[PDB]
Nucleic acid binder design. Structure first.
Ligand SMILES: [Mg+2]
Ligand SMILES: [Mg+2]
Ligand SMILES: [Mg+2]
Ligand SMILES: [Mg+2]
Ligand SMILES: [Mg+2]
Ligand SMILES: [Mg+2]
Ligand SMILES: [Mg+2]
Ligand SMILES: [Mg+2]
Ligand SMILES: [Mg+2]
Ligand SMILES: [Mg+2]
Ligand SMILES: [Mg+2]
Lengths: 86, 63, 139, 190, 143, 139, 97, 62, 55
RNA sequence: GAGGGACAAGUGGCGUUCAGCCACCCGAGAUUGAGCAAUAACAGGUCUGUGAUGCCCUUAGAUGUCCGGGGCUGCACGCGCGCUACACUGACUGGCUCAGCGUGUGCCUACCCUACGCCGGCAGGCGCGGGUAACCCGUUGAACCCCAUUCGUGAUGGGGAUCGGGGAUUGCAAUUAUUCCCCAUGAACGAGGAAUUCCCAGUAAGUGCGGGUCAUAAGCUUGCGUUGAUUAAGUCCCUGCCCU
């Protein structure tokens, strides 16, 4: 029936924002080109800053880890800790 | 915490009035002296009476 | 590493729309496919679980829909299915999105024809297994 | 005979640059320890809470809100990640910026009521340094929690961001926001 | 030197023990576990395909630990928390069919000896197998 | 030459049999490196990481615990080692070194030699816990 | 051959134990110890009231059942010789060969 | 607009409708040994160094 | 032949004590009733009634 | 089981010789939690506790006691104690790892606790064994927690309410109430306005187990354990009570 609630707080971040499921061509190219410029390779910053999901972000970070460009410092449950040498 | 009962202070005053030369400044000796010279069923009451007896000794011997 | 495959939205059984998050969690979006049945159909279809829903062969999609429309040919015994023995046919089968609502309407229609009190409480705005209705079941 | 250290740290030359918070932060050599998960029995005496290490205090204030109420292994793990994130962000030692955050993360004087049974005025009076440390840790953990609420960022990540934006005078952290919220009322009722 | 499964870390041990059981093919899996079997009383199916080998390896470790357990004993060894939704949770046991399955499979592959006063216990052949696998896991760790 | 020193955490008891040897810590047959929480692999190492290595190489200790909780067993092992060294330095080595190593342990922490008089209180017949009560009802 | 003294009151338990050890020291029998069993306790919680007025205030009744065991290996004639003892009714005697 | 520091000499007593502040006659470190009485809410001992923001204040409540 | 537990035989004996004591204070209300003492003996079960008027 | 051990004792300050507070040490403890708890009231509740009872009604077409159904559950609504969630400090999967009270049989009138093997996916069945108990369940291999994977801010895989089909168990009988398991349908709920409840250290809270009714049987209650906070240690402003 009718809807009743004692609060009114609308206007969230972005309107059911879309996010990249699979990596694109130019987007993943930009990822691989400017990813050495970062200081802390963390999946949350890679996901939110560069319009990536967490799954594709962790997949790209493990792919670059297998490539050997970014050294893992201490991997754990939810705090993946990666750092570029020099 | 040491706001002890009138019967505790009264028993200690009876001890210090009857037997004064038997008592000193050491609690571990005054407790055994009070158990030789009196009958107290409760060990906490023994410790409390003997402690206030030591306090009365420190008060009388000083002033 | 699967750069880009031109597949976002599929059309399954004239009503359902497949998602894009996973294959085993986009088949979940079909009404009639819940939590475990999607992973069972995936294990019968032998698809890599890491792959998305938009990275999959259309022939393999037809194979998945074949497993949907007839699961009892290969495997998946009678207990795992939704539509059990009481059909008026005895057909051990899995329901479709269009078929499940039709079977529910047939259930409610024969309950109305019997005039059983379960069908009567469903015909009214009541609860069948809602044993307390003082506070429960408002508006 | 080795030096006391949290992880692979040193815990040396980390000094409080001012006074009015000395001898209440346990950063020095006489109160150093390996893990924050210590024998925390610091609630019987009135003033034995000040000898607690501030990293253990940060874990204890981090564990809140029912679903995370307890779990010292989890919150010591979060602070262990957060110190490493702070270190990987441009060096700038995490114990040192934690001391700087306790110095510059909140109150100097706060508003409260006085007697006379009259008009509610909320006059700003000076606040104890113990309560400054308490409310600073409270504002830091509250800001980290409701900054990491509903995003991909972790508790350790937003706690590290909170400590960095509170040590640096950038006014982009919730501790500095409620610091401003207190001193504007303090300047009003001064 | 002296290598023991108590000395070796477990999550390096069982992760290789599943592979060294796949190398020998020491698993029977008749029809229903060929098809699908869920967890204790839960929602989903386990993810990584070698979970039967993982159950057999955990069974082997627990029969190394406690000699004399059985079906319901190992069922309560596994156990778990059963979230019932609105109604609060309790402790639910595992399953009996996988327990008798893994016991019958390892007895047929000569790794479980029956106790005349109890149930499962370690065989000397399975003892040698687990000790040499712990030795090569510790060697791969120290290498 | 063998001294058995005991535990005494809240509901955790660690029997530590110490004897002269070549360097061993046996925790129910499982060595020092396998601490059951990964986070607390610095707090139980405090007789190792602070006191020295020749002391470890001189004294063999085996520890068996029948405790109740994880943190309780960790502190029971910690207290049992830190008391077992003190008791072995009572029974075999001189007091001139025993008092020095005991002062080091005490000035590091009191709980390394002093037990903790903390047990959980009884649940009250009025409220849900030991101090709390249920919610009232006014108008 | 063992004898179990199952008792209701611990003071009469210790009295009959002291009497039994005092009567068993002088004979040429290897008298084993009066093994202290853990005390059994039957706690019962009660509403305190026939009608429910007031706070949830509960009676908490208890018992303290004590138990001791001794081992006296002897032939049945010596067992029947030891058996005849006048005892307080708070203690019950059982034998097991 | 200076910012001064002050360590506590003596503590008079707690004050307020709740008893939440504390009349503290603190002292002046940066200047000569002058005496004002301040309200310091929260726990305080003799010797607690405290940051002041105005030195022209007043003992508030009698 | 038959046996029960120690945790139940004592409470059965106590219910027997209360049953006998309160039934004797029901029916022996005429003379002065004080209490009862029962000795557990497998040969002769002795029950001692302590009464004020023993007549 | 007995005895010891802690008494604000020792020091310094605050206080009138005082009564007593504060900091430290030695110490396990500078004191834990309960029971009992006066003089005297409420015209508080209970005759639905009785073979405790005064007065009134009935006693043969019964207001006695049985038998067979329905009912206390019934719904436009408001209120109270609670449980589950509104998630990423998280949900799922797998591995690892730790307990404490206490209960249990042929009953002074009906009855369990459960190991082992096989079958079934599961709820369960079958055969066999121990326990009237520190012996057998049981070295109560609990949950929470810890490690690895997946999920990625989407009312999403959180939430599981409602609802259909089937399969097991007690009970003589389960459908307009049992209970448990599988499949499927997948709502509100985005941290809650006015107001309001409890709480000072192994304490609140998270979390599981045991007893009570039980046959089926806890979301209640009583107790036990695991992890374990923040901030006061002050006051008469709000409320209630006491004294003069
Ligand atoms: Mg139902
Ligand atoms: Mg109603
Ligand atoms: Mg009532
Ligand atoms: Mg009274
Ligand atoms: Mg009569
Ligand atoms: Mg009537
Ligand atoms: Mg409710
Ligand atoms: Mg019955
Ligand atoms: Mg319906
Ligand atoms: Mg309920
Ligand atoms: Mg109130």
């Amino acid at each position: 029936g009718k809807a009743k609630k004692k609060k009114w707080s609308k206007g969230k971040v972005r309107d059911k924002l879309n996010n990249l499921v699979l990596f694109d061509k130019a987007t993943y190219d930009k990822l691989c080109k400017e990813v050495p410029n970062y200081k802390l390779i963390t999946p949350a910053v890679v996901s939110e800053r560069l319009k990536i999901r967490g799954s594709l972000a962790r997949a790209a970070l493990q792919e670059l880890l297998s490539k050997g460009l970014i050294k893992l410092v201490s991997k754990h449950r939810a705090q993946v800790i990666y750092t570029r040498n020099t | 915490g040491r706001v002890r009962t009138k019967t505790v202070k009264k028993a200690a005053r009876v001890i210090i009035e009857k037997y004064y030369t038997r008592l000193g400044n050491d609690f571990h000796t005054n407790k055994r002296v009070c158990e030789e010279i009196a009958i107290i069923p409760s060990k906490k009451l023994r410790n409390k009476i003997a402690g206030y007896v030591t306090h009365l000794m420190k008060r009388i011997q000083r002033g | 590493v699967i750069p880009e495959k031109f597949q976002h939205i599929l059309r399954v059984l004239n009503t359902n729309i497949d998602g894009r998050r996973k294959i085993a969690f986009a088949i979940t979006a079909i009404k009639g496919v819940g939590r475990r049945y999607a992973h069972v159909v995936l294990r019968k279809a032998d698809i890599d679980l890491t792959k998305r829903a938009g990275e999959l062969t259309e022939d393999e999609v037809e194979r998945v829909i074949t497993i949907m429309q007839n699961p009892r040919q290969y495997k998946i015994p009678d207990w795992f299915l939704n539509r059990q023995k009481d059909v008026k046919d005895g057909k051990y089968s899995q329901v479709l999105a269009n078929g499940l609502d039709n079977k529910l309407r047939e259930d409610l229609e024969r309950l109305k024809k019997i005039r059983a009190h379960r069908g009567l409480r469903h015909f009214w705005g009541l609860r069948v297994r809602g044993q307390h209705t003082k506070t429960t079941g408002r508006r | 005979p080795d030096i006391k250290l949290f992880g692979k740290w040193s815990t040396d030359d980390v000094q409080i640059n001012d006074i009015s918070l000395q001898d209440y932060i346990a950063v020095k050599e006489k109160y150093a320890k390996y893990l924050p998960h210590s024998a925390g029995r610091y609630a019987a005496k009135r003033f034995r809470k000040a000898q607690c290490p501030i990293v253990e205090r940060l874990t204890n204030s981090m564990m809140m809100h029912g679903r995370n109420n307890g779990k010292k292994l989890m919150t010591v793990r979060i602070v262990k990640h957060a110190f490493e994130i702070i270190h990987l962000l441009t060096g700038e030692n995490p114990l040192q910026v934690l001391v700087n955050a306790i110095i510059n993360s909140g109150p100097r004087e706060d508003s409260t009521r006085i007697g006379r049974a009259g008009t509610v005025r909320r006059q700003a009076v000076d606040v104890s340094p113990l309560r400054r440390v308490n409310q600073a840790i409270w504002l830091l953990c509250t800001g980290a929690r409701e900054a990491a609420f509903r995003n991909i960022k972790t508790i350790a990540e937003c706690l590290a961001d909170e400590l960095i934006n509170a040590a640096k005078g950038s006014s982009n952290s919730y501790a500095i926001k409620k610091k401003d919220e207190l001193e504007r009322v303090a300047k009003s009722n001064r | 030197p002296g290598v023991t499964v108590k000395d070796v870390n477990q999550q390096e041990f069982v992760r290789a023990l599943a592979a060294f059981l796949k190398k020998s093919g020491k698993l029977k899996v008749p029809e229903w576990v060929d098809t699908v079997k869920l967890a204790k009383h839960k929602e989903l199916a386990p993810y990584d395909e070698n979970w039967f080998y993982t159950r057999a390896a955990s069974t082997a470790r627990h029969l190394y630990l406690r000699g004399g357990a059985g079906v319901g004993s190992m069922t309560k060894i596994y156990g778990g928390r059963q979230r019932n939704g609105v109604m609060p949770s309790h402790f639910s046991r595992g399953s009996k069919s996988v327990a008798r399955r893994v016991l019958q499979a390892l007895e047929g592959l000569k790794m479980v000896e029956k106790d005349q006063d109890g149930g499962r216990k370690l065989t000397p052949q399975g003892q040698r197998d687990l000790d040499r696998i712990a030795g090569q896991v510790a060697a791969a760790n120290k290498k | 030459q063998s001294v058995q020193v005991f535990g005494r955490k809240k509901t955790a008891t660690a029997v530590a049999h110490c004897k002269r040897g070549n360097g061993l810590i046996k925790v129910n047959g499982r060595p020092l490196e396998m601490i059951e929480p990964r986070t607390l692999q610095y707090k139980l190492l405090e007789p190792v990481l602070l006191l020295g290595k020749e002391r470890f190489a001189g004294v063999d200790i085996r520890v068996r615990v029948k405790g109740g909780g994880h943190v309780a067993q960790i502190y029971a092992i910690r207290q049992s080692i830190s008391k077992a060294l003190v008791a072995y330095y009572q029974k075999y080595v001189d007091e001139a070194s025993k008092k020095e190593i005991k002062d080091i342990l005490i000035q590091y922490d009191r709980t390394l030699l002093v037990a903790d008089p903390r047990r959980c209180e009884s649940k009250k017949f009025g409220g849900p816990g030991a101090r709390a009560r249920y919610q009232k009802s006014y108008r | 051959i063992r004898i179990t003294l199952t008792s209701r009151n611990v003071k009469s338990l210790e009295k009959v134990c002291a009497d039994l050890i005092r009567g068993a020291k002088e004979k040429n029998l290897k008298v084993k110890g009066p093994v202290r069993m853990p005390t059994k306790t039957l706690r019962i919680t009660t509403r305190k009231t026939p009608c429910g007025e007031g706070s949830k205030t509960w009676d908490r009744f208890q018992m303290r059942i004590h138990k001791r065991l001794i081992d006296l290996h002897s032939p049945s004639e010596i067992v029947k010789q030891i058996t005849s003892i006048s005892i307080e009714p708070g203690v019950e005697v059982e034998v097991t060969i | 607009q200076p910012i001064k520091l002050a360590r506590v000499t003596k503590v008079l007593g707690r004050t307020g409708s709740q008893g939440q502040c504390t009349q503290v006659r603190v002292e002046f470190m940066d200047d000569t040994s002058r005496s004002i009485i301040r309200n310091v809410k929260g726990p305080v001992r003799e010797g607690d160094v405290l940051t002041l923001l105005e030195s022209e204040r007043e003992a508030r409540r009698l | 032949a038959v046996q029960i537990s120690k945790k139940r035989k004592f409470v059965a004996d106590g219910i027997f004590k209360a049953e006998l004591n309160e039934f004797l204070t029901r029916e022996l209300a005429e003379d002065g009733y004080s209490g009862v003492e029962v000795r557990v003996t497998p040969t002769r079960t002795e029950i001692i009634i302590l009464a004020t008027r023993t007549q």
